[PDB]
Amino acid sequence: RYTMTLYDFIKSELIKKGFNEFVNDNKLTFYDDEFQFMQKMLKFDKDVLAIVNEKVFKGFSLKDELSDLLFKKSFTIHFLDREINRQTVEAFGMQVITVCITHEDYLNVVYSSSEVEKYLQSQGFTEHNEDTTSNTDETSNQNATSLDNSTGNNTIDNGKTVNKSSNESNQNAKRNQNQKGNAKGTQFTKQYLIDNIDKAYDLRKKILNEFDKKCFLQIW
Amino acid sequence: VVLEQRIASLEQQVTTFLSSQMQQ
Amino acid sequence: VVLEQRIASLEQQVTTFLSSQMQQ
Amino acid sequence: VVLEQRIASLEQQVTTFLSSQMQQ
Amino acid sequence: VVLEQRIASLEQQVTTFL
Amino acid sequence: VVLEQRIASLEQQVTTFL
Amino acid sequence: ENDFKYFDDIRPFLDEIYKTRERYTPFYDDRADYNTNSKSYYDYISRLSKLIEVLARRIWDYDNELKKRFKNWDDLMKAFPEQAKDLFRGWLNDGTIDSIIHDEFKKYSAGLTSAFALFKVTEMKQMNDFKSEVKDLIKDIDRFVN
Amino acid sequence: FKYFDDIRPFLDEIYKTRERYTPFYDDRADYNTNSKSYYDYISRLSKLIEVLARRIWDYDNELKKRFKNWDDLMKAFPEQAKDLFRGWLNDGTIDSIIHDEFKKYSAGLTSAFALFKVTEMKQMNDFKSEVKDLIKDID
Amino acid sequence: TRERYTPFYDDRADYNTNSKSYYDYISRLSKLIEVLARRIWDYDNELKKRFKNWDDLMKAFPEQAKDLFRGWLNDGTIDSIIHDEFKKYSAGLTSAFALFKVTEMKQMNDFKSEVKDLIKD
Amino acid sequence: RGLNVELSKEISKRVVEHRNRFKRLMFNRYLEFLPLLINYTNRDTVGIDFIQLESALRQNINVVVGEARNKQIMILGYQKRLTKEDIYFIVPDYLIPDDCLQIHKLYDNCMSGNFVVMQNKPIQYNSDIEIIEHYTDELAEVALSRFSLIMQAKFSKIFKSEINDESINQLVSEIYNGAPFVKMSPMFNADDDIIDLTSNSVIPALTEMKREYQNKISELSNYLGINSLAVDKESGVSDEEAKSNRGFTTSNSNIYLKGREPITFLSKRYGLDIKPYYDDETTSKISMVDTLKDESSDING
């Protein structure tokens, strides 16, 4: 069973756009490696990229612009001399839907675990005080004194003092300790277990043969 | 016998039919 | 014996010629 | 015998053809 | 026989027809 | 007789001649 | 002239399909069992359904068109006595001319214009005489002061 | 060709089926699935949707006939209005036209200019009475 | 034999049959041709009555044409044709006569002015 | 020159050529044989080339055998309205009767002048050139399936090793040269490492398919009367071993015989015995066991 291939598609659509491989300028250019179409598809220049992105991926681009060239290259040079399944070009729109899943892990696969943390932290805090004391105190004494002088008339004196002294004191005191904190933790722990590369051997294989399952004639 | 009478009678009827009514 | 057969053959010959011009 | 029956059959046919030729 | 007589009568009829 | 048979074929040939 | 080569640039693309049209069997193959899917009953009543509704509406709305067309019948009926009296005033225009107009109304034109214009001429002569006989006494007696 | 036929023997034609004996195990209907019945039903149902559209053609052909008959009769109608008016002139109803044409208008014009001329003459008598009196007053 | 679909073509007819199955759409279409058939019947019931009315008028037209024409608005039309352009030599004539009399009276006013030289003292 | 071959799925065109050629061959062979089954006490005294008769009968044209000069030359013959005269088309040249012909069926038993018509089949409903087309396509695709089954029933012993010159010296000097006691490394080097692709899902399937081909031949065979029937009566293998339902194959054999019944009507006229028998004989051993008269020794040897 045989239908259209995919090399013949972009060859015929690129030769629709004025190109050629035999008599291009005027000199015989069949042997010159920068002109025949197979080198333009294996190098996968701007030109073949434009014709694939217009006729095969008619409304698609991936996330980035460096991975997206890698995906479109790794699609169209796996499947050059392959087949077609659903019998008409611009009618294997099954290709656009098998594109339309979000398994876009063609660039920067960091699954050497790479645990990223964040830890934001705010804090608010007020405070108040009211400290009031009040003293009361009073005193008293007595001062029974005497002296008995004598010469060789013999003068004598006696004294008393009474000295009370009352006192009091009172004070208030208020405080207001306003306060706030902040903290911004961050960790970036990466791990490197050994057997992750075993799981990473086929990250692209099960998406690449998915097109064989759903878009290409899986018979001779 | 009577078979000779029958053979004589059938020639008579054959002559009668083939001579009187038609030629065929 | 031989006559019995020729007499039968000629009677059918008369009968298949009488019916060619018969009223039947 | 059987040749006599054949000779009888042939003269009957010749008489029928002669009646076919001449009207009576 | 009688068959010979009938055969003789038939040749007489054939000769009369001629 | 056989002579009658011979006379019958000559009559047949003469009738076929006519 | 050697013009109109529009019958002629078709030639390299009219021999081309005649070349690649019937010489195919050494170059191609007959395999692979292409399926053909062609139009069950639902596409048949598709073909019939729009076709019947596009005249189902166009016989449902025949009543308003017919209502117009037996409205203007009665419009003609109410317009008819106007057209009858308009037709009648056409012929009597020439009709009244033979009766009175090549006749008595010419006499009325004569008598009711010429005679009264003569009366106007007599009134003008009279009023010139009255202008004079008013002026004839003003221009003689009042002048002795001025 | 206007025939309100009747309403009932048309509404049974859409609910009527003969149900002939088509044999099973033949190639008239090979798989005998229920699809050829659908084709033969809807195609046989769309006859009457031609029928009543032909009835619309009957209506409009008749109305064209009707307005055409009216238009030709309006063509013929001035040939009746003439010789109707000849009936209106050779009889004595000319006494409408000559008397209603004559007397009222002639008397109106004569009496109108007579009233106007006598009023103008009274105006001139008034005017001369105005003129002759105003000159005497000085001496 | 060998059942082939030798045409394979393109169509231009449109469909959203608001119906559960093919079957119920056949029923709906049956109801629809029934109701517009009843519309055709009341077109007939209207239109036979209209033509029993109309063709009477087209049959009895000349008698009606003699009858309605004799209505006595005719004198009004005759007053219109005497008041027509046929009168209007007399109309413009009498209007010019009135203008000439106004011309006379304003000329009287013209020679009134030669009196007022020494009307003062 | 012009050459660019397809692939070696050329066989998948050779397979369908074998089917197509088998249908064409079996169809025209089966009607190449079918106009000779009866042959009816072969040329006792009667000047008929019966092979030319039976070939004419199986294109359904009603032949008519009568007399020409008393010796039964064939002629062609194309409620009961009787036929008498030589109105029909006549194939011989000057041997025509030029006299009273008749059909010798019901005018009497054995009396009228002979021109009897022989039908192929007494009542005709369908031609059996359609039944022979009816089974030969079904037979064709079972012959397809047998040929396709034995074309893929071929077997290799797959050696499995990392390639360049490890196991080649093994099989050369120690398998096809027949050698027992081959010594190998401990590196699992035959721990089911060599494997056999077999098609033992194909050879039990093979014999049952041949039995389906065989009884489909027999189910075409008993339809058109050609049968193994009389020997099956004397062999006692009468029913459900020869799966044929004997009452149906002795039924369809008989219709062709009583179609050729008017040769007995002719046989009663001129005084001779012609019976339409049904040929099933094949000689040099059957003719030996039915006679074992020493003159039949000098015939054969």
Coordinates of N, CA, C and O in Angstrom, one line a residue, chain J residues 148-150 152-155 199-207:
Chain J
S148 N -1.5 -20.2 -0.8 CA -0.9 -19.2 0.2 C -0.5 -19.9 1.4 O 0.4 -19.4 2.1
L149 N -1.1 -21.0 1.8 CA -0.7 -21.7 3.1 C 0.5 -22.5 2.9 O 1.4 -22.5 3.8
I150 N 0.7 -23.1 1.8 CA 1.9 -23.9 1.6 C 3.1 -23.1 1.0 O 4.2 -23.5 0.9
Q152 N 3.9 -20.1 2.5 CA 4.6 -19.6 3.7 C 4.9 -20.6 4.7 O 5.4 -20.3 5.8
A153 N 4.8 -21.9 4.3 CA 5.2 -23.0 5.2 C 6.6 -23.5 4.9 O 6.8 -24.6 4.4
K154 N 7.5 -22.6 5.2 CA 8.9 -22.9 5.0 C 9.8 -22.2 6.1 O 9.4 -21.1 6.5
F155 N 10.8 -22.9 6.5 CA 11.3 -22.8 7.8 C 12.8 -22.6 7.9 O 13.5 -23.3 7.2
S199 N 6.3 -22.8 11.7 CA 4.9 -22.5 11.3 C 4.1 -23.7 11.7 O 3.3 -24.2 10.8
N200 N 4.1 -24.1 12.9 CA 3.2 -25.1 13.4 C 1.8 -24.5 13.8 O 1.0 -25.2 14.3
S201 N 1.6 -23.2 13.5 CA 0.3 -22.7 13.3 C -0.3 -22.8 11.9 O -1.3 -22.2 11.6
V202 N 0.4 -23.5 11.0 CA 0.1 -23.6 9.6 C -0.2 -25.0 9.2 O -1.1 -25.3 8.5
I203 N 0.7 -26.0 9.6 CA 0.4 -27.4 9.2 C -0.8 -28.1 9.8 O -1.2 -29.0 9.1
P204 N -1.3 -27.8 11.0 CA -2.6 -28.4 11.3 C -3.7 -27.8 10.5 O -4.7 -28.4 10.3
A205 N -3.5 -26.6 10.1 CA -4.4 -25.9 9.3 C -4.5 -26.4 7.8 O -5.4 -26.1 7.1
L206 N -3.5 -27.2 7.4 CA -3.3 -27.5 6.0 C -4.2 -28.6 5.6 O -4.8 -28.6 4.5
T207 N -4.4 -29.6 6.4 CA -5.1 -30.8 6.0 C -6.6 -30.5 6.0 O -7.3 -31.0 5.1

